[PDB]
A paper describes a structure:
ADP-ribosylation is a reversible post-translational modification involved in various cellular activities. Removal of ADP-ribosylation requires (ADP-ribosyl)hydrolases, with macrodomain enzymes being a major family in this category. Further analyses reveal DUF4804 as a class of MavL-like macrodomain enzymes whose representative members show unique selectivity for mono-ADP-ribosylated arginine residue in synthetic substrates. Crystal structures of several proteins in this class provide insights into arginine specificity and a shared mode of ADP-ribose interaction distinct from previously characterized macrodomains.
Two of the representative proteins in this group, CG2909, and CG3568, are from Drosophila melanogaster, indicating potential evolutionary connections between the prokaryotic effector and the eukaryotic proteins. The ADPR interactions in both CG2909 and CG3568 are similar to those observed in MavL, with di-phosphate-binding loops and catalytic loops matching the sequence motifs identified from our search. In addition, water molecules equivalent to w4 in MavL can be found in both structures with distances of 3.4 Å (in CG2909) and 3.3 Å (in CG3568), suggesting that this macrodomain class likely employs a similar catalytic mechanism. In MavL, the adenosine was stabilized by π-π stacking interaction provided by two aromatic residues (H142 and Y265), whereas in the two Drosophila proteins, a π-cation interaction involving an arginine (R198 in CG2909 and R209 in CG3568) replaces the imidazolium stacking. In Arg-specific macrodomains, the core β-strand connectivity appears to be the same, yet some distinct differences are observed: In both CG2909 and CG3568, expansion of the variable regions from β7 to β9 (compared to β4–β5 in MavL) and the additional β12–β13 were observed. Interestingly, CG2909, CG3568, and Larg1 all harbor a hydrophobic residue (F137 in CG2909, F148 in CG3568, and V77 in Larg1) equivalent to F105 in MavL in their insertions. Note that MavL, CG3568, and Larg1 harbor a glutamate residue (E107 in MavL, E237 in CG3568, and E160 in Larg1) at the same position that does not interact directly with the distal ribose. On the other hand, our study also tapped into the protein-level specificity: MavL interacts with Ub and effectively removes ADPR from ADPR-Ub, whereas Larg1, CG2909, and CG3568 exhibited rather weak activity hydrolyzing ADPR-Ub.
Residue numbers in the entry: 25 to 262, 269 to 506
The structure:
């Protein structure tokens, strides 16, 4: 899961949304480096350091940096695209007055631009410490966004709803970028005397794990089963009138192609699927599917980048969701089970994946994934995908001639780097990635405005590969 075949909904609203996608053209605005740097100096959030910025890079790197800037895009799974459409339909029918008025004329591309542009600058912790684009700082209050009890400064026109942030956890960012240092957790933006020990550049991908810190929102709604959340009143377990909550459960269940969700007392006694945790029950079957969406996007993206680079990809894989967001003891095993599954399902498509390197994992071996293993790939020019499992720094120099594809653990409601923008330069993987690359500008929708935008959305499709959304919709 997911399957290779996607089903096209026949209803007029979906057909119209796809028609509009099929009218989009790829942006091709010439990159003006001086214009970029000026935009960056006027960005609505302050940089604690400049060493990870375009302006601090050598002049002899300007040509490549211009290409890196134009190489950036947001990217979602083809199934995520259909989910976004179904979300718009659901909110236009069941949303509040506040929600209905902002989604009224919104296209798919517009919703994606909103998820990029209206996310907070930072947003971290179980109690939602935040800075909005308008500079307001506080804790909590996002549960009320987009409801008739919403209030300044957390209103739908300014910030995202938790229902939207849950969507945004499926929206990833990718670009080529200079590497400043080896990108260790504690790099803190340090500059090196020379880059003899590191790769000079590569692909950097912001992926987002599942978040369970905050009850009754995000992936907790789908994967966590608790006594207070999983009730008939909240739309679970479904001669009953449809409610907004129950309809929203249905579109997420249909996204995961699950035939039911659960009332707490109705959950089967089955430890191959369910794990008891402090909050209640953790459903590793739906967790595997949520991972599979992220991993499909990553692998199809890495394949496309590597094919255009003319060399195999070396993927630095991090445990998204397994750090400060770790929520179950078997979760890392579900992670690796899911990843092996997608490597095998995608099969011959991954001709240009060379090494998958799991960095900072506690399990040495899950299924066939252990250090030195090779997953065979039909017609792969090197016979298969090499697996590694050991700590490395993402920017370390490669002994093979391969394209480094560096993942970092991001956040659905924060700019790349997240607490980086609160001047916490050493914390989690997120500020470490911002400090050691150019993504704090190149993946920033308020700085890389011509390429990090909804109109440049790309789609990862099992059948059609990685395509700009216009090309993808036209092939449907
Ligand atoms: N010193 C280390 N060096 C490298 N990897 C490490 C280290 N310590 C832990 N890991 C592993 O690093 C991996 C990633 O752990 P995390 O960075 O917490 O990510 P998440 O997805 O759980 O939390 C994301 C949120 O935290 C940020 O604020 C974001 O913006 C979000 O708000 C795990 O395998 C860890 O075991
Ligand atoms: Cl500096
Ligand atoms: Cl050098
Ligand atoms: Ni083996």
């Amino acid at each position: 899961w997911p399957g290779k075949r996607t089903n096209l909904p026949e209803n007029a609203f979906t057909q119209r949304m796809l028609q509009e996608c099929g009218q989009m053209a790829k942006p091709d605005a010439s990159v003006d480096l001086d214009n970029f740097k000026a935009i960056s100096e006027q960005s609505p959030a302050e940089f604690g350091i400049d060493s990870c910025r375009v302006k601090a890079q050598p002049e002899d790197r300007s040509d490549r940096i211009r290409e890196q800037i134009a190489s950036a895009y947001p990217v979602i799974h083809e199934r995520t695209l259909l989910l976004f459409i179904s979300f718009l339909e659901h909110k236009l029918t069941f949303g509040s007055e506040q929600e209905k008025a902002i989604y009224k004329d919104m296209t798919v591309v517009d919703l994606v631009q909103r998820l990029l542009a209206k996310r907070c600058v930072w947003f971290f912790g179980a109690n939602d410490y935040y800075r909005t684009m308008q500079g307001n700082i506080g804790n909590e209050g996002f549960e009320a966004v987009g409801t008739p009890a919403e209030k300044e400064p957390l209103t739908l026109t300014s910030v995202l709803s938790y229902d939207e942030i849950k969507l945004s956890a499926l929206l990833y960012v990718s670009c080529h970028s200079e590497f400043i240092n080896n990108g260790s957790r504690v790099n803190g933006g340090e500059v090196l005397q020379n880059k003899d020990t590191i790769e000079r550049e590569g692909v950097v991908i912001g992926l987002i794990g599942a978040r369970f810190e905050r009850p009754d929102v995000m992936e907790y709604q789908d994967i966590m089963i608790t006594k207070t959340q999983n009730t008939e009143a909240n739309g679970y377990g479904f001669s009953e009138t449809v409610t907004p909550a129950s309809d929203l459960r249905r579109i997420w269940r249909e996204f995961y192609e699950e035939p039911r969700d659960f009332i707490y007392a109705d959950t089967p006694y089955d430890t191959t699927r369910f794990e008891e945790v402090s909050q209640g029950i953790f459903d590793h079957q739906v967790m595997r599917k949520r991972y599979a969406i992220s991993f499909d996007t990553l692998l199809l993206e890495a394949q496309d980048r590597a094919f255009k680079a003319g060399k195999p990809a070396y993927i630095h894989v991090v445990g998204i969701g397994l750090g400060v967001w770790k929520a179950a003891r078997q979760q890392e095993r579900t992670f690796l089970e899911s990843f092996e599954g997608r490597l095998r399902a995608l099969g011959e498509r991954l001709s240009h994946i060379g090494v998958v390197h799991f960095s900072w994992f506690h399990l040495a071996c899950v299924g066939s994934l252990h250090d030195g293993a090779i997953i065979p790939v039909d017609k792969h020019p090197q016979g298969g995908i090499r697996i590694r499992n050991s700590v490395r720094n993402p920017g370390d120099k490669l002994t093979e001639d391969m394209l480094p594809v560096v993942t970092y653990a991001w956040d659905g409601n924060a700019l790349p780097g997240n607490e980086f923008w609160a001047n916490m330069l050493i914390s989690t993987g997120d500020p470490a990635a911002a400090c050691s690359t150019l993504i704090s500008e190149l993946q920033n929708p308020h700085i890389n405005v011509h390429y990090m935008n909804g109109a440049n959305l790309h789609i990862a499709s099992v059948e059609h590969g990685l395509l700009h959304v216009g090309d993808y919709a036209r092939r449907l």
